[PDB]
Amino acid sequence: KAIPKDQRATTPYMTKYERARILGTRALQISMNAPVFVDLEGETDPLRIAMKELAEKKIPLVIRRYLPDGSFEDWSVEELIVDL
Amino acid sequence: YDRKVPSPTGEYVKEPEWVLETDGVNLSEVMTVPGIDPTRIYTNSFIDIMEVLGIEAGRAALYKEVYNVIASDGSYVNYRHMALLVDVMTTQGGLTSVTRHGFNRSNTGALMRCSFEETVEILFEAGASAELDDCRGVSENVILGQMAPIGTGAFDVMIDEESL
Amino acid sequence: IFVYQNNITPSAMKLVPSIPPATIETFNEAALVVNITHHELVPKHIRLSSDEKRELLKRYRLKESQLPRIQRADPVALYLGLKRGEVVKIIRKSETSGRYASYRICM
Amino acid sequence: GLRFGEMERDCMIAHGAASFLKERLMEASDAFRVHICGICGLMTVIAKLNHNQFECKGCDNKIDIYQIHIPYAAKLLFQELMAMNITPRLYTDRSRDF
Amino acid sequence: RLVKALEDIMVHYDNTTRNSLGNVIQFIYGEDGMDAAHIEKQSLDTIGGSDAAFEKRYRVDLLNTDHTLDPSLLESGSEILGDLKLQVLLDEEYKQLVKDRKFLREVFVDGEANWPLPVNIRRIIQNAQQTFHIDHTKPSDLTIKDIVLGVKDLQENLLVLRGKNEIIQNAQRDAVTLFCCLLRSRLATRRVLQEYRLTKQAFDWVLSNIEAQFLRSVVHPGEM
Amino acid sequence: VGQQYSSAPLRTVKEVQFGLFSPEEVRAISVAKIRFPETMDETQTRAKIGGLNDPRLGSIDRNLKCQTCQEGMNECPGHFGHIDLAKPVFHVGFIAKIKKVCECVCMHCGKLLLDEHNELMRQALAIKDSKKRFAAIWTLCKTKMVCETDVPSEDDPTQLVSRGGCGNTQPTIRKDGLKLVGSWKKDRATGDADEPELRVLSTEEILNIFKHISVKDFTSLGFNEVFSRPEWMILTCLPVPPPPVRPSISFNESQRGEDDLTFKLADILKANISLETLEHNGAPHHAIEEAESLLQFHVATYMDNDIAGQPQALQKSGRPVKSIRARLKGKEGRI
Numbered sequence A: 001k002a003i004p005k006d007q008r009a010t011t012p013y014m015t016k017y018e019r020a021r022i023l024g025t026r027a028l029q030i031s032m033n034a035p036v037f038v039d040l041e042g043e044t045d046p047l048r049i050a051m052k053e054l055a056e057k058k059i060p061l062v063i064r065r066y067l068p069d070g071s072f073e074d075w076s077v078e079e080l081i082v083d084l
Numbered sequence B: 001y002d003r004k005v006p007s008p009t010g011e012y013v014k015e016p017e018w019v020l021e022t023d024g025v026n027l028s029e030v031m032t033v034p035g036i037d038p039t040r041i042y043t044n045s046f047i048d049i050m051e052v053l054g055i056e057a058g059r060a061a062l063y064k065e066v067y068n069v070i071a072s073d074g075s076y077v078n079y080r081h082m083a084l085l086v087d088v089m090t091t092q093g094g095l096t097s098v099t100r101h102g103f104n105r106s107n108t109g110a111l112m113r114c115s116f117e118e119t120v121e122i123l124f125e126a127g128a129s130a131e132l133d134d135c136r137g138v139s140e141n142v143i144l145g146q147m148a149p150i151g152t153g154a155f156d157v158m159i160d161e162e163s164l
Numbered sequence C: 001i002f003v004y005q006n007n008i009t010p011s012a013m014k015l016v017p018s019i020p021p022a023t024i025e026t027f028n029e030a031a032l033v034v035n036i037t038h039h040e041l042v043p044k045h046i047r048l049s050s051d052e053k054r055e056l057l058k059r060y061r062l063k064e065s066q067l068p069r070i071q072r073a074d075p076v077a078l079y080l081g082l083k084r085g086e087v088v089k090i091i092r093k094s095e096t097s098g099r100y101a102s103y104r105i106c107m
Numbered sequence D: 001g002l003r004f005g006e007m008e009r010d011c012m013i014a015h016g017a018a019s020f021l022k023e024r025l026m027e028a029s030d031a032f033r034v035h036i037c038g039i040c041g042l043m044t045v046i047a048k049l050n051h052n053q054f055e056c057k058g059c060d061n062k063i064d065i066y067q068i069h070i071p072y073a074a075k076l077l078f079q080e081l082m083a084m085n086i087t088p089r090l091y092t093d094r095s096r097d098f
Numbered sequence E: 001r002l003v004k005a006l007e008d009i010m011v012h013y014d015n016t017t018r019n020s021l022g023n024v025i026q027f028i029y030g031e032d033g034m035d036a037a038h039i040e041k042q043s044l045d046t047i048g049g050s051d052a053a054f055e056k057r058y059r060v061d062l063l064n065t066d067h068t069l070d071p072s073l074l075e076s077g078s079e080i081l082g083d084l085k086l087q088v089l090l091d092e093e094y095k096q097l098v099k100d101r102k103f104l105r106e107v108f109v110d111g112e113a114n115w116p117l118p119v120n121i122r123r124i125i126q127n128a129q130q131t132f133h134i135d136h137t138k139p140s141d142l143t144i145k146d147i148v149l150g151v152k153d154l155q156e157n158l159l160v161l162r163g164k165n166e167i168i169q170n171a172q173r174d175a176v177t178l179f180c181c182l183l184r185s186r187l188a189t190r191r192v193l194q195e196y197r198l199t200k201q202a203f204d205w206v207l208s209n210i211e212a213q214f215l216r217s218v219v220h221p222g223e224m
Numbered sequence F: 001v002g003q004q005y006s007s008a009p010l011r012t013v014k015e016v017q018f019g020l021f022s023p024e025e026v027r028a029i030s031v032a033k034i035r036f037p038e039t040m041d042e043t044q045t046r047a048k049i050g051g052l053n054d055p056r057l058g059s060i061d062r063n064l065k066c067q068t069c070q071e072g073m074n075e076c077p078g079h080f081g082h083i084d085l086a087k088p089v090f091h092v093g094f095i096a097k098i099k100k101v102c103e104c105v106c107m108h109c110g111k112l113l114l115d116e117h118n119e120l121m122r123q124a125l126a127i128k129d130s131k132k133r134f135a136a137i138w139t140l141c142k143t144k145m146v147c148e149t150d151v152p153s154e155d156d157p158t159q160l161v162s163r164g165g166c167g168n169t170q171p172t173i174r175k176d177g178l179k180l181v182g183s184w185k186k187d188r189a190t191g192d193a194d195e196p197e198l199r200v201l202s203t204e205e206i207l208n209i210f211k212h213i214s215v216k217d218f219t220s221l222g223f224n225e226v227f228s229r230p231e232w233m234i235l236t237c238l239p240v241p242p243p244p245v246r247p248s249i250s251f252n253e254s255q256r257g258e259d260d261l262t263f264k265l266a267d268i269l270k271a272n273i274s275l276e277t278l279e280h281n282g283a284p285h286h287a288i289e290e291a292e293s294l295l296q297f298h299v300a301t302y303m304d305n306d307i308a309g310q311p312q313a314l315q316k317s318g319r320p321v322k323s324i325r326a327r328l329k330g331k332e333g334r335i
């Protein structure tokens, strides 16, 4: 039921799961001829590209982490600290 | 038994102690006998520990028992896995078994796995009781053609409109 | 608190719940010759105030039905004269972290 | 051997691979498109896709409505429940009026 | 039967362990909110040994010619002698370690010192020494406030729970009590100057590392 | 899936709320009424009578017409029918529940045979599992065969306390196929009260007694005041599943052939009609009771074929028979 960008108690870090699904969804779009936001310095494999987009923080996605009570927090991929 | 105790100088030292092992159990009464240490009495019957020392005590015994069964073969399992099992078995203030106690489920949903050759009968009862399926299981989500809210599916992904 | 010896007449037993809000408790001497709470396996149980209780549910955002339970006639609850709906903070030692605090609502 | 049984499922569950679980267990049946009322989790919504008019009587509802994709096997399994006087209300929300 | 009964229990975003009904099974996973594959058996030194050995290893008394830090373990060695203000800081650290010894001897009545925990401190330390080519033949450039205040500040960053309310902050202190007892025994001023011979640089590196590893050892919401 | 567009927001099912179909609801969501248990032959014209198979429900013949909704014979969610019953009928799947419930509540005023004035009952009322409670309560109330008016309170057993103003005795209900029979008496093995009064409990009595049970009472049982009320286990208004559920194997044209579930709906309706064309033209007391049981048999066999018989007569002297309870014999086993 929405939670202000402030008062977020959830981890600043990306979960292995979040990352896995983000790399999976994004790779699906790349494989379907969807535009890429990172300079393709050779890479051709969609996932390999998706990963490059994650590092350079150019994936316009948002994770809606729901809490067991129904409420939820909204974190942007860009915002999430990636270290797994 | 040799007992690891702090010596007057601080370092742990072994101090032998006489202990009594019995065939048969009557905790409530033996505990009351004079000359013993009621604070340290114990029994491999976690059930009696529960009825006499309370659920919390019961949980700890239930743990110690499971632990020994595994430590028995020199095997090791991180504490958290046996602790989890022991908690599930104790949440409702009692000692619930894990070996298919309920003739219906364990913690599944009606729309979940089509257990028994007759799922219909389970559906009737659900209807007459106003059962509410949370839809967190795999099977139930399969039938709905959706991924279960587990691991990778425990959150939603949405397009972002902030990135310039 | 009524402390008796061997037992009480079932007739007399049905004389306890009859003077609200005052409650009457019964204890068999045998069951008191030893303080169970003084046992290794029995951790610290602390009755929570309705205040703390509200605070507890608010932060973990839980329904009363989502909290672990403890039986009303549980030896420790009987000890602290717990009444249904009351919560107890259980402070136990942990080999994982230092201490771990759990909660149980009296059924 | 050569099968994806209950034990193979538990494994992927522990791995947290929900997508794989859904992919490996989704029946070939068509992902039929149904309309449902937000008041009653029933598929009693008369959808006029050309004139853009969705109306569910008994609830006086024309606005609060949703759309879902579920295998035909489910659509049937549900109508069979309705036929047996059993209501399998499908809700898009978890936190009810609670 | 084991799988079937525990199959719907998952770690949620609040670090809570719950079943499909949303019932709380554990207020924090494994009572420490940590991922088991990031846990290593480490020895809690503070607990074992004689009291003399305990004091010979942790006690630092600037107000005593025989129990101060020899000027060779630290540059400010000779001017630390009889420093009332620092000693007050050094007594705080000792009393805390002595408290731990009690606490640990209650948790492990057996006296067992080796227990699985996150962030292998011994390794981070050995690495530091290798990475900065530390030579045990020179006095460190670490201030006492460096060690004590630094070790103290780090304990405030090892996060499992982030809620801003009272309850959580307390649940957060409990879940990191044990690791924190380990930490203090490994980063006790004397150990830092007399045993490890860490420099201000090496030391600073060790702290940020423990933090990065700690946070990295935390369980991920979604774990089945 | 269905290249057509829909402004309705696309979402995933988060929760599933089960319950019972109330008679008022089955009507509030129907479209037709299904009176004529036949099809086609509109004056020898092989079209489609407004009685069954098409009055308003989904259609065929490549006709986009279907209650102003368009869509094709593959992108259309069959609309549910409607068919009123002349008399109430026990639902096959709940005869067991209906029996126990009757033994928990007084068969006259509809008040629970035991309440808070019974220390053993309270321990039962506290049970959370609606299934475990209903059981723990039924085990206590099935013994009591008298509706107590005054019971000794928690206080002085010397004094009594009044409750349900009713005091009639209860029947020892037993099952006999699709019917329930109640036996009355005045205390087991005693003078001036010997010999029982055996009479069959009519579907109407049960239904009307279930309507006098308070919310607090049926909730004490696993019932829900919004989704599952006791009375609803007794059918008064049967829902007619649209054609998508029950098809019709017809090769191209000319040939009829309709699903085996439509054939059953026909016979159900038939009996329902021969039951109404008696209370209208006046009829014997036992005569009507004949059609009643017949109807029950068809309404029961329809939803679940597994009672006192094997009704097999669907356009085939070979005697075949299908149903809904036995429809997942390749659906609950295919998934």
Ligand SMILES: [Zn+2]
Pocket (backbone or CB within 6 Å): D037, D038, D039, D040, D042, D044, D056, D057, D058, D059, D061
């Ligand atoms: Zn509706």
Ligand SMILES: [Zn+2]
Pocket (backbone or CB within 6 Å): F057, F058, F066, F067, F069, F070, F071, F076, F077, F078, F079
């Ligand atoms: Zn239509």
Ligand SMILES: [Zn+2]
Pocket (backbone or CB within 6 Å): F106, F107, F108, F109, F110, F111, F147, F164, F166, F167, F168
């Ligand atoms: Zn009555």
